[PDB]
């Protein structure tokens, strides 16, 4: 459950380090996003010398939430950290590496580039 | 269960007083809605007397008050309420399974119109 004014750490190799959510795409009154959704967000912190400079407005996709999704089997998954990966207009990540585990829900949304680079997909 | 117009602390302190008077005197005088609640806590307290274990005695000793029912001239040995329950009241109902109490209606009280009853131990 991610809405406006909600921050989440970045999980790739681009310059961004922390990100604040600006808007959730999808509909007129939508007010909450979960794993696999794309949001518009701004950069609050950046490592020096990074590709993405502090203060930019970029789109991004959620890879793991504190309250993860449920599967049709009836099983669940939850992480201990909200994370975020900055993407281009297509589904191609801006960075070169992905850190930490990634939920399997990203596979079903054609985010194959992120899935391949993750250390493991749970 | 039902409240009795008093907070949680004062309710427990009231059920322990009434349940002990019914043991000591075997016939008391309460209001109708107040006698329908010590019916439960007295029969559940005879049952601990039909076991006779030390474990059951220590459990019931945490509910009975501590007053002398009567002095026995053995050398004077005061007899306490817990001794009466485990040596006199309990052996009386060795054959009956349930229902060691009966409730008999009397009529309204003058001061506030409360409906009074007689609750006996037979």
């Amino acid at each position: 459950m991610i809405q406006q004014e909600s921050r989440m750490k970045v999980a790739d190799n681009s310059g961004a380090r922390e990100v604040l959510t600006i808007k959730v795409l999808g509909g007129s009154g939508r007010k909450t996003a979960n794993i696999g959704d794309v949001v518009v967000c701004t950069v609050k912190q950046a490592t020096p010398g990074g590709v993405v400079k502090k203060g930019e407005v970029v789109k991004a996709v959620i890879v793991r939430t504190k309250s993860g999704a449920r599967r049709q089997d009836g099983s669940y998954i939850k992480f201990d950290e909200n994370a975020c990966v900055i993407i281009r207009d297509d589904k191609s990540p801006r960075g070169t590496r992905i850190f930490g585990p990634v939920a399997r829900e990203l596979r079903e949304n054609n985010f194959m580039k992120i899935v391949s680079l993750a250390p493991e997909v749970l | 269960y039902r409240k009795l117009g008093r907070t949680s602390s004062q309710r427990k302190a009231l059920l322990r007083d009434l349940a002990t008077d019914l043991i000591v005197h075997e016939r008391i005088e309460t209001t109708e809605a107040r006698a329908k609640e010590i019916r439960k806590v007295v029969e559940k307290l005879i049952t601990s007397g039909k076991k006779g274990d030390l474990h059951a005695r220590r459990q019931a000793a945490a509910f009975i008050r501590h007053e002398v029912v009567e002095v026995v001239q053995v050398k004077n040995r005061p007899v306490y309420a817990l001794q009466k329950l485990f040596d006199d009241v309990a052996p009386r109902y060795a054959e009956r399974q349930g229902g060691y109490t009966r409730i008999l209606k009397k009529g309204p009280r003058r001061g506030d119109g409360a409906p009074m009853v007689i609750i006996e131990l037979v």
Binding site: - | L104, K106, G107, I118
Partner: protein, 53 residues
């Protein structure tokens, strides 16, 4: 929150149509043969269901 007109005697009497109180549900004891409330212990002959509580 303050009355606009005073209440007439007709309307003040109509409202009290339901301000009566019912007749008690009394009965007759078999032993002492006087009036008694149902499901209650007889006050005078001091008995109930013929057991003399």
């Amino acid at each position: 929150a303050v009355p606009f007109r005073r209440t007439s005697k007709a309307k003040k009497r109509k409202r009290r149509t339901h301000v009566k109180l019912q007749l008690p549900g009394m009965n007759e004891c078999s032993n002492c043969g006087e009036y008694r409330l149902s499901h209650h212990v007889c006050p005078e002959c001091g008995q109930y269901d013929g057991k003399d509580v």
